[PDB]
Structure formats: C-alpha cells, structure tokens
C-alpha cells in the first residue's frame, strides 16, 4: 500500500495531485482507495494557454481557473 502511494506521488498529505483517468492507473488507485480522496478535475475556462501559466489556480471544488486576479 505504502509503495502504491509512493509511486502515486501522494507522499505528502492533503495535497492535490493529478492523474490520467486511464485504467492502468486505476489499478493502483483501486488498491489504495480507502487511503484517498479522488474527485474529477473540471476546466470551466477550458485549458491553459501559455499566456495563462502564471495565473492558474486550483479551487477546492475540484476546478481549475485560468485567469487569476485581474488587476
């Protein structure tokens, strides 16, 4: 279990991390599912372009925001 979690980069608690929703990974997640909290990412403004890289924030509802704090 420990090493699943190690190779998930889930080392440090209460920290979000991102992963492919493919099955290869779901093997692992299925092994540890009681140790974790999974929630779907959501992209309301859509995906970050390069200009939006320094402005991108992640809200606890599981949502990504591209433009953070205009002027």
């Amino acid at each position: 279990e420990k090493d699943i979690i190690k190779m998930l980069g889930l080392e440090k608690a209460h920290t979000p991390q991102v992963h492919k929703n493919i099955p290869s990974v779901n093997a692992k997640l299925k092994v540890v599912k009681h140790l974790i909290r999974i929630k779907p990412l959501k992209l309301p403004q859509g995906l970050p372009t390069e200009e939006d890289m320094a402005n991108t924030c992640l809200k606890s509802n599981g949502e990504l925001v591209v433009r953070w704090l205009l002027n």
Partner: protein, 94 residues
Amino acid sequence: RNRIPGRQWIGKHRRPRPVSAQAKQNMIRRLETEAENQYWLSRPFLTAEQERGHAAVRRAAAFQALKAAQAARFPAHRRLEEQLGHLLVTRKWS
C-alpha cells in the same frame, strides 16, 4: 475495587471499552468518502488496448535522463586559484 486481570487491553480478558456515537459518525464519514471514490473509479476514459504504449516516448526518455544523471559523476575539476588562493592567508600591510 473492580479490577482488570493482567494487562489492560491485551489478553483473553479486557477492559470493555464501548463504541461512541462519535465513532459511529467518523466511520460513516469515511465510508461516504470511499463510496464516492469507488464511484469515480468506475468509468475510465480510455479502454485497455486504447492505452497501449500511449506514452512509450516519454517513459524511455525519463529513464535516459536518469541514466544520464549518473553518467555525469566524476571527480571535480581542480583549479589553480584554490591552491594559490590559500596564500592570501598571509596577505599583509607594510
């Protein structure tokens, strides 16, 4: 005057301690989170053969970086400026 035989929590006779309403709550709470988890783990994006080799490109390259990392270990360059700069020790006014 009511005693516990031996060690508190250990043997064939134990201090009785009861479950708490609190405890019931905590457990349910975890169960909730995990029901949600095994939901989100149900319906994958890709199928199985769909994800075949889908980054075989990246995964060998990371490993070539890993290889290249230890490639590079050799003793360090040694320079004049050190051996001689040790003489600044005696730097004087006169």
